[PDB]
């Protein structure tokens, strides 16, 4: 066993995540009226996920 093996193991372990782009949250304003705060945060998380 060697350190570079551990480094490549750590590299393999890391997983992708959904990046935030310019046009990700623009639609929020469309459905921003009469919406509960918790639901708004849940939608933000859903887009982020």
């Amino acid at each position: 066993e060697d350190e570079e093996d551990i480094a490549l193991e750590f590299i393999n372990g890391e997983k992708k995540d959904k990046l935030v782009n310019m046009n990700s949250f623009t639609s929020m304003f469309d459905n921003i009226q009469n919406v509960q705060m918790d639901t708004f945060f849940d939608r933000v998380m859903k887009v982020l996920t």
Partner: protein, 388 residues
């Protein structure tokens, strides 16, 4: 005037730097690439044709070039001078692909295989002092297929892998070739004997090799072959090349290349048996410019990269499998670097000012994060990734 809730306010006051230092991080940034250009590899002794193939030595700091000039020029890449170690002109033998080979058991054994649109292959033994001190080169010609001449018309497309003869536990190299009708011919690297042959339906377009470790000192070599339609075959070369898996590339059509990365491969060869690792990535090119990326850990691609609008001519991963470099020979400056597993193309590099020409060869150094890109004008340009 003269856990606490105000912790966040205080820490902001302490520092005006809020981006975490990338020096500590072992994972390269997703969208920003720190890349610096160095001296060209071919500057010292220019080539007279397009750079058809590029290959770094597995351990030594050498770069091998080939082309229709029929010369195997070997350069000592230091990044500042890049002088030429040796040259070997092969009369009447255009070079479509060349590669170093180091025996996995006998580290002292080094060898170069070169092939072209001919019915023979050349092997150049670099062991001991043959590379530099010797006045003459020890060259052998492989021209015998042992009854299978009809399947093979040219040695031009070949790759070299390691096969472990399980019943004896001995490990030796194999030379893989492309046949006329889905035929893959496998030869012994040293003796040249025909070991086995693999057949797929349709026209063979490209193939690649994947290693799956079994136990201490045991590993199996898998041959992955793909058809123009996109059907992928996986043969087990340790069991007479019998099919073990069949699947199709989702949305695949006009496939052109296939590659694996994240473990041992021709670009990232091993030095001992324990260094053998399984590849976690698989990329499938196409004429349309799409590159479906698959996670080896019917399959559904993780991403469908579509930045290039021309046929994919080179697909290659970094030795650690964190960058995928996809390039096309159809047009100029058709090269992109894709960050894995984010599958996001780097934006800062290449630029309109980056000189690449008609990219026709790409190579990642086994270590040091150097990238060499050859073009149709015969120039091998060298870049360094500062993260490595």
């Amino acid at each position: 005037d003269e856990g606490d809730i105000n912790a966040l306010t205080k820490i902001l006051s302490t520092t005006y730097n809020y981006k975490d230092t990338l020096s500590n991080s072992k994972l390269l940034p997703p969208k920003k690439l720190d890349i610096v250009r160095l001296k060209d590899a071919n500057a010292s002794h220019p080539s007279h044709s397009a750079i058809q193939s590029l290959s770094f030595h597995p351990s030594k700091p050498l770069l091998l070039t080939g082309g229709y000039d029929k010369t195997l020029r070997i350069y000592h890449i230091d990044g500042k001078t890049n002088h030429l170690v040796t040259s070997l002109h092969l009369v009447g033998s255009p070079i479509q692909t060349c590669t170093f080979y180091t025996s996995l058991s006998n580290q002292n054994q080094q060898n170069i295989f070169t092939a072209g649109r001919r019915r023979y292959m050349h092997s150049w033994d670099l062991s001991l002092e043959n590379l530099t001190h010797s006045q003459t080169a020890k060259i052998e010609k492989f021209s015998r297929l042992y009854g299978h001449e009809s399947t093979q018309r040219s040695f031009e497309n070949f790759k070299v892998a390691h096969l472990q003869n399980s019943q004896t536990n001995s490990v030796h190299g194999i030379v893989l070739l492309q046949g006329n009708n889905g035929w893959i011919n496998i030869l012994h690297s040293t003796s040249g004997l025909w070991l086995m042959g693999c057949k797929i339906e349709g026209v063979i377009t490209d193939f690649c090799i994947d290693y799956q470790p079994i136990s201490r000192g045991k590993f199996r070599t898998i041959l992955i072959a793909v058809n123009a339609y996109g059907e992928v075959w996986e043969f087990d070369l340790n069991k007479n090349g019998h099919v073990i898996r069949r699947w199709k590339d989702q949305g695949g059509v006009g496939i052109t290349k296939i590659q694996v990365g994240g473990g041992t491969t021709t670009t990232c060869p091993a030095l001992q048996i324990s260094k053998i690792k399984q590849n976690r990535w698989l990329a499938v090119g196409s004429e349309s410019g799409f590159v479906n990326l698959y996670d080896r850990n019917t399959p559904t691609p993780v991403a469908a990269l579509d930045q290039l609008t021309t046929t994919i001519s080179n697909l290659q991963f970094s030795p650690d499998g964190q960058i995928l470099c996809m390039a096309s020979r159809a047009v100029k400056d058709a090269l992109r670097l894709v960050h894995l597993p984010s599958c996001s193309v780097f934006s800062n590099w290449p630029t309109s000012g980056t000189p690449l020409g008609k990219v026709t060869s790409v190579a990642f150094s086994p270590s040091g994060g150097l990238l060499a890109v050859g073009n149709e004008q015969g120039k091998v340009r060298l870049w360094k990734l500062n993260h490595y």
